[PDB]
Amino acid sequence: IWLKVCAASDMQPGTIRRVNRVGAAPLAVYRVGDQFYATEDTCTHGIASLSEGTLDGDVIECPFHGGAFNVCTGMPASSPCTVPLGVFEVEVKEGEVYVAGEKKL
Amino acid sequence: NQIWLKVCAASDMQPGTIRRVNRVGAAPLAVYRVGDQFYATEDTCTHGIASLSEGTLDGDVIECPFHGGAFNVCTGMPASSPCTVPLGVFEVEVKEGEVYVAGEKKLEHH
Amino acid sequence: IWLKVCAASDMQPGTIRRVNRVGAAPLAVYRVGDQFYATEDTCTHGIASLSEGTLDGDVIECPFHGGAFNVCTGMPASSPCTVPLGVFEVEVKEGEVYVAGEKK
Amino acid sequence: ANVDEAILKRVKGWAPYVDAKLGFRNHWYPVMFSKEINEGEPKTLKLLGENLLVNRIDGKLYCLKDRCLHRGVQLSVKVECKTKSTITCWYHAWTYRWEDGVLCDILTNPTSAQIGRQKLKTYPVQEAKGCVFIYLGDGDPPPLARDTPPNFLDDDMEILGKNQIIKSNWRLAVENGFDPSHIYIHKDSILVKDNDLALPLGFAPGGDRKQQTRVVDDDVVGRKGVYDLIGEHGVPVFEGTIGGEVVREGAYGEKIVANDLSIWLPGVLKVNPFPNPDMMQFEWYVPIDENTHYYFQTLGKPCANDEERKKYEQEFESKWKPMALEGFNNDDIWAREAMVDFYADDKGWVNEILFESDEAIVAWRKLASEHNQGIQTQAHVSGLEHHH
Amino acid sequence: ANVDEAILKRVKGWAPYVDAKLGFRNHWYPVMFSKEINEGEPKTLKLLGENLLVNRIDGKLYCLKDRCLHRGVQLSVKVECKTKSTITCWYHAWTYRWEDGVLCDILTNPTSAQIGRQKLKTYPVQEAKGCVFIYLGDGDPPPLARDTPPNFLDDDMEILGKNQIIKSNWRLAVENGFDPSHIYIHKDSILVKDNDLALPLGFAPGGDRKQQTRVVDDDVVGRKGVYDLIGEHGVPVFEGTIGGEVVREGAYGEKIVANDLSIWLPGVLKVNPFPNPDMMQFEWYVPIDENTHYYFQTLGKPCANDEERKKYEQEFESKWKPMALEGFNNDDIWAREAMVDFYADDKGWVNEILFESDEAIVAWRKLASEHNQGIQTQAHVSGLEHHH
Amino acid sequence: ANVDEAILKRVKGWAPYVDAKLGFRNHWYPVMFSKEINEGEPKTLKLLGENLLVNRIDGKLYCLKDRCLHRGVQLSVKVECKTKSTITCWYHAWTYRWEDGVLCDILTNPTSAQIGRQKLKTYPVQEAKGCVFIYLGDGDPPPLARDTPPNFLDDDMEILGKNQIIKSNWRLAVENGFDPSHIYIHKDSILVKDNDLALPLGFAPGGDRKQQTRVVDDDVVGRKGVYDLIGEHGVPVFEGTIGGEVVREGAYGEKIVANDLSIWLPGVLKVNPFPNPDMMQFEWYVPIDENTHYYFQTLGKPCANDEERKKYEQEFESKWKPMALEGFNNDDIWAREAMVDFYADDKGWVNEILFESDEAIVAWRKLASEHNQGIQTQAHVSGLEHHH
Numbered sequence A: 001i002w003l004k005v006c007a008a009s010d011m012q013p014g015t016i017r018r019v020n021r022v023g024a025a026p027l028a029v030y031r032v033g034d035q036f037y038a039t040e041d042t043c044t045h046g047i048a049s050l051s052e053g054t055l056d057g058d059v060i061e062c063p064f065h066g067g068a069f070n071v072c073t074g075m076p077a078s079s080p081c082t083v084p085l086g087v088f089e090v091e092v093k094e095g096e097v098y099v100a101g102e103k104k105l
Numbered sequence B: 001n002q003i004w005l006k007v008c009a010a011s012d013m014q015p016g017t018i019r020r021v022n023r024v025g026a027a028p029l030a031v032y033r034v035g036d037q038f039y040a041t042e043d044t045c046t047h048g049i050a051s052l053s054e055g056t057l058d059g060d061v062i063e064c065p066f067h068g069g070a071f072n073v074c075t076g077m078p079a080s081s082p083c084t085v086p087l088g089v090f091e092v093e094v095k096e097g098e099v100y101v102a103g104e105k106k107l108e109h110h
Numbered sequence C: 001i002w003l004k005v006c007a008a009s010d011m012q013p014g015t016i017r018r019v020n021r022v023g024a025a026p027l028a029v030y031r032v033g034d035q036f037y038a039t040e041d042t043c044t045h046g047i048a049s050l051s052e053g054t055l056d057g058d059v060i061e062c063p064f065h066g067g068a069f070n071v072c073t074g075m076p077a078s079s080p081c082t083v084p085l086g087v088f089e090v091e092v093k094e095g096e097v098y099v100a101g102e103k104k
Numbered sequence D, E, F: 001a002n003v004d005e006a007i008l009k010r011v012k013g014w015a016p017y018v019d020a021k022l023g024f025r026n027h028w029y030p031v032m033f034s035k036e037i038n039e040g041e042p043k044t045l046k047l048l049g050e051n052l053l054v055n056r057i058d059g060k061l062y063c064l065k066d067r068c069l070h071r072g073v074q075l076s077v078k079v080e081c082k083t084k085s086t087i088t089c090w091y092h093a094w095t096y097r098w099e100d101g102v103l104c105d106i107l108t109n110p111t112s113a114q115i116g117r118q119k120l121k122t123y124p125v126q127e128a129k130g131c132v133f134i135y136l137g138d139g140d141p142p143p144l145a146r147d148t149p150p151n152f153l154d155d156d157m158e159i160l161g162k163n164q165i166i167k168s169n170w171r172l173a174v175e176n177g178f179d180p181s182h183i184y185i186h187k188d189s190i191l192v193k194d195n196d197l198a199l200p201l202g203f204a205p206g207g208d209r210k211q212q213t214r215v216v217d218d219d220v221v222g223r224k225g226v227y228d229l230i231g232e233h234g235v236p237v238f239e240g241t242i243g244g245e246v247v248r249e250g251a252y253g254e255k256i257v258a259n260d261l262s263i264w265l266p267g268v269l270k271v272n273p274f275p276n277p278d279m280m281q282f283e284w285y286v287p288i289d290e291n292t293h294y295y296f297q298t299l300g301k302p303c304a305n306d307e308e309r310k311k312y313e314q315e316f317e318s319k320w321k322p323m324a325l326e327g328f329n330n331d332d333i334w335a336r337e338a339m340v341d342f343y344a345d346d347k348g349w350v351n352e353i354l355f356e357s358d359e360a361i362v363a364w365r366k367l368a369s370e371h372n373q374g375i376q377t378q379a380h381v382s383g384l385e386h387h388h
């Protein structure tokens, strides 16, 4: 049900970390201040990797065309994006970050 | 009609406001209050069919609500394009705090 | 070899003087502050006289098309000028302005 | 905005209208006649700057944007409808359903993550009175009646018409159609003599500004429009003069027509009665792009039975269409075209010198600015942009 | 202004000239020949970007702007001269007097408050030497002679010509005409051989700059121009060499011509004597719009009576027009067209690399920038703008 | 730059590429075949927006900018090569040497100070494999090998081809040629059937994204390119299904081709083997201007002697050219044309919705952005600008 991402200290606020899973598409973990969030890594507008994008607050900008998503809600923040990003439950326990196997129901 | 048309009391008009004066069998006039002074011109913009009394007054310049053209309310001369034809100016006087406007327009200056 | 141009005081600061040379192309003597420089007078981009241009610091702007040159190096400072200007060595001795015979 | 801000600032009375160069979004628009679109034969057209595809499946019409989501090519370049309910792009085979535009398959990669996740833009399509109407808007559409003039949809009202593309912005067409004094250009129309019509040259207005028209924004159907009442107090001109000398006469025919004129959003005119005392004319000026429009003409006439509908159709083909729609309205076409240059740079909206009868046009401009359902923009054409 | 300010800043020596893409306002311009405009037969033309209408009434010419004040259509789309002294717009019948452009009547509304209170733009028109000149300016016009080259108006000077529209900005045409070295393009003209002309290939300049031309700004009639004196101190080039070897020679004919060349504002060249020792050539390059001009060519030859006038006319039609105006100047036409691309983006005014003989053109550019009577702008065409 | 800055800011993965509307400067480009230019017969052409002139003197090719330094006219309007090694402008006779572009003479003024002090732009020209390559760049050129696909220059490789002008930006051409899934457009090609080729409708990607392509950042000669490896771990699709039903099948031929596909800077595709097992296709998409490109096609086959070359040449003319170069690639031509509108306003570079196989295109866009040798700008065309 959960995947070990990294130690909460390995991520500085405002940074992104890509999580490659076996047999499944990659995910992206963002650290907005002291809280962590996760979504699909692939931009819903194409085939770009959001982990290679730019994070401003709780908004992630795609490197391909400038589309953006709110990393908390996974909702489109900037055009041309229109399709909601899948959000995955994140959990910090004993100074370590974990991500849910499947996206939130 | 007659030489002087009674418009209203000078007190019924706030500085920088405009009042339309309708006349039986004649085109409407517009009376402007610039501070404590009064001026008047035809109410219809010379550039079209707009009512200048529905425009915006800035100092002594009235801006038409249709196309942005404007006129100097004292001289009736165009102040902003696309207006090019001067307005007829009608003398205004205050007799016992009562505002009166001429029934005939002033005859060409200089 | 050197050619006596004029007294340093014959030129106000920031001005330019055209120096004609029988049987040779005209020269331009520029006064930048209290310093003097010399180059070919004809703009390398056409037939304009640089002496009729605008001097801004050590850069002369051509009156024709706005091209420019650094009066010290002769190198273009602004387009459309591309061909470097001929620079002539200059020395002032005892308030007298002297310009080298040939470009250098 | 589609126009220089300096100009919009100047036309304080109808800026939204002046800015609506591409037309109003979120309104129904007629684009062709039902009989022009056959079962399983997709047809292309441009509406409000957007390339669209219309198809008939099991007798019902469907509309998809004619632009593949992938590399933006028009699907219509090479139509591939491989199953009854879908259309496949000729380039990389992305396949869409006509009913909801959903990307349901991709022949070049059946495993793509885009399948089932992307959706091509669809637009509501409705047929009425043998006319194909498309709702160029977003969300569930309002009743078609809201965007049609009164009586057009009457049960007994048999509708027949003609449609074509005209080279002028749609607004120039609308204003020319609702222009009370433009009647002067129709003074030599064959319809006048050949149909013994009464037709003045113009009108000497009478009454106050408000009496010149009847603005409608209290229509239970939601209709928004303006009635031209210049003839209620004005004296019609039948003898045109210059320096006091008569130089032209109006038509002293017996048939009274065009005394009930109204313009309705999004841009459809109702002329009643016309071209005959027992008929009505309904014409739309549909925006194709900023320089062109569909001049969708329809003539209506009550018909109690097939026998009447057939006799009506016969006279339509033999008389009305050639003598009226063409014989009368053809002059309106080049009239619209004649106004293109003055307004092409948007400066005409500022330099025009209007006179009395234009009060009807002013009323329309204000009504349209106040009650339109949206301003179509180039961004709507290429793809909405926002950093919100 | 009409040009990117960054470019104008660069051409300090003649910015007004470079900005005058549409030509200079407030000058007289020939636009057609008298015999081309007949009684009550309105002709249309575009001058300095403005659409104009010219008509001949009781023999006199009148000029009105071809654009109704109302909705800005060209009256010429459907001309309606209902009376001899007026013209009526085909749209809503606003009627104007040719004499002063006053809106004297409106057939569609005889009670309109606009009647007698609007005025359509008119421009002075004058016929001289069988040529029609229009003063495209405001206020009282100056004497025609001011905008004509010396001797064009002489009593006995018989003027004949030809006119056409050429696809190039007017300045390119002017410069090519006053270009001392362009003579090279005429080396194979049929006129050279067929009229035994002496024609060098170019000139090796002599003397200083000021001596290359003569700037005229003290003429009593007020005409402003420049004389090309390159031949006063320069050595004519008859043997063209490459690497010291003769590859081409000039013409060694007996007839000496074109040794008296001058260009005059607003843009007319005087070539004397040409194409024959007893004749003169006067040509105008009139601005129609930013991309085209009228190439108004005239040949003048003194004639003392009707007998010599007839003879000259016959020689003109059989020889001068085909051998000179066309046979010689046709090369000037494509030469002008060849410079279009380089100057079309206005960059050529900065990137051109001039040589000695261009001193004549620079003189002209300076004179034109200093003495022109006004810069025509796009606002003059649409309607002057100004905010309080 | 050449594109709206707001757009370039959005395409962070490849802004230089998107900005490279006019192509990449400082690279070699093929423009014609050697047999198309004969001794002393100058030929014109436009490359990267620049008008050029190519001539063959004593068997060797030379290239000069087709724009006179004086008034910017094209020398080619009227060619005047008066000596074997020079070209003289038809206007004022400024003469230039083909060898170095130096202004060696001016027939109209042999005393001009401009002589020997100006230089017309020249570009390196090289012939290889019967093809004429021009280095549209500044300074000393790199080896031609750097800008050619591997093996094109092999000693025994016989090259034969065809060239034409296609109406689409060069990039649209490049991406279509290197597009793994575009083969769907070739499903009905005569070549597939007539040459028993195996051709799937597309590929179901296999492995990771990194395995989809192979980038070559450097080579013996500094080549820069990308190999399409979608077929290494991908599953070829031979049955196209919609809703699970088979609506189309790929071609089950026996000849396996194009297993080796790569795109290289400045924009040349290598397909090996194609269109037959013993052959190779090398094709360039040369930028002419922002809207057009040369589609320079070539087919290569190793030949050990004149006998095989003769045979190959016969087969090329009778089969390969008409069946492959035209019968196969003609569909690529209209496919490129189909993408023009979407990218014409530069908005397609933002709004496109890519899918898996586009990894190939993305890899090329990044490679091109990172390794091109310069972005051609309109300033290079008119004349480089810069203020001190």
Ligand code: FES
Residues within 6 Å of the ligand: A043, A044, A045, A046, A047, A048, A062, A063, A064, A065, A066, A067, A068, A079, A080, A081, F350
């Ligand atoms: S692929 Fe992310 S915005 Fe387009």
Ligand code: FES
Residues within 6 Å of the ligand: B045, B046, B047, B048, B049, B050, B064, B065, B066, B067, B068, B069, B070, B081, B082, B083, D350
């Ligand atoms: S009606 Fe007043 S500016 Fe036009």
Ligand code: FES
Residues within 6 Å of the ligand: C043, C044, C045, C046, C047, C048, C062, C063, C064, C065, C066, C067, C068, C079, C080, C081, E350, E352
């Ligand atoms: S002549 Fe000096 S910048 Fe052109």
Ligand code: FES
Residues within 6 Å of the ligand: D068, D069, D070, D071, D072, D073, D089, D090, D091, D092, D093, D094
């Ligand atoms: S452009 Fe339509 S499937 Fe690729």
Ligand code: FES
Residues within 6 Å of the ligand: E068, E069, E070, E071, E072, E073, E089, E090, E091, E092, E093, E094
């Ligand atoms: S446009 Fe001329 S009268 Fe209306």
Ligand code: FES
Residues within 6 Å of the ligand: F068, F069, F070, F071, F072, F073, F089, F090, F091, F092, F093, F094
């Ligand atoms: S434009 Fe070529 S020599 Fe003058």
Ligand SMILES: [Fe+2]
Residues within 6 Å of the ligand: D176, D177, D182, D186, D329, D332
């Ligand atoms: Fe009409």
Ligand SMILES: [Fe+2]
Residues within 6 Å of the ligand: E176, E177, E182, E183, E186, E329, E332
């Ligand atoms: Fe000439």
Ligand SMILES: [Fe+2]
Residues within 6 Å of the ligand: F176, F177, F182, F183, F186, F329, F332
């Ligand atoms: Fe292909």
